[PDB]
Amino acid sequence: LRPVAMVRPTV
Amino acid sequence: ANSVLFPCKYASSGCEITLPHTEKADHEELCEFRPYSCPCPGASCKWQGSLDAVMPHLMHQHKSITTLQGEDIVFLATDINLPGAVDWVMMQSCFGFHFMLVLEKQEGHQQFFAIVQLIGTRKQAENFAYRLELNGHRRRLTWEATPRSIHEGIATAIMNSDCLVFDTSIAQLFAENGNLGINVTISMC
Ligand SMILES: [Zn+2]
Ligand SMILES: [Zn+2]
Questions:
Q1: Residues of A whose CB is below 8 A from B171
Q2: Residues of B at the annotated binding site?
Q3: Residue B127: partners with Cβ closer than 8 Å, 6 or more residues away
Q4: With 0-12 CB in 10 A as exposed, 13-18 as middle and 19+ as buried, what is B38?
């Protein structure tokens, strides 16, 4: 399968 | 042949190597005992240290960065249309090694740059291969390359467009409601 990481933006 | 042997400037860190003036500068860039800078995108972190201190540095001073286990994962960059310069970062743990997965957005039109970076030495980096995928309605863009050692950096890689490069128009073909999913696959060779 494929685990999903929800990465947030750094500005 | 017979020049005057002047030794490496990292000799006081264990670089037991002595060479002529003509090939000193070209060793010190690719030296094992040279110090490593912080692999995170942007210049905000000015940290420096050894390879063994990197993971500590990341874990201690960058707790926000998430690590997924797997050779094959999905790196979901959220809110991709927020204007201005924007970075996304995460790590991938596989094959007994840590990899750093970076997506940069650079501003007339905006462009996305996506790259993988081994947390290890250059020679260690050559053993691996990475693959980035974007997937859409009967569309698929794929970049494959050797990961860069954090010893090199991504600056010149990104400047040479030596990675997955794509503008915001493409982005919209592969994104849903400001979310871009990048299927990252690391492998050995
Ligand atoms: Zn040296
Ligand atoms: Zn740092």
A1: none
A2: 8, 15, 27, 31, 38, 45, 57, 62
A3: B188, B189
A4: buried
Method: X-ray
Question: Minimal Cα distance from B90: which residue of A?
Answer: A7
Separation CA B11–CA B94 (nearest Å): 33
User: Which CATH number fits the domain that encloses residue B20?
Assistant: 3.30.40.10
CB contact under 8 A, B68 and A5: yes
Does B32 share its domain with B68?
Answer: no
SS3 B184: strand
CB atoms within 10 A of CB B159: 9
Residues B44 and B83 both lie in one domain: no
Annotated resolution, angstroms: 3.0
Mutate to test the interface with A, among B67, B73, B176 (most CBs of A within 10 A): B73
Which tokens sit at B30?
């690719």
Q: In terms of domains, do B90 and B160 share one?
A: yes
On whether both B166 and B112 belong to a single domain, the answer is yes
Structural domain for B50, as ranges: 1-58
Q: Residue B43 C-alpha to ligand 2 middle, in angstroms?
A: 9
Q: Are residues B82 and B172 in the same domain?
A: yes
What's the number of domains chain B is made of? 2
Cα B90 from Cα B75, distance rounded (Å)? 8
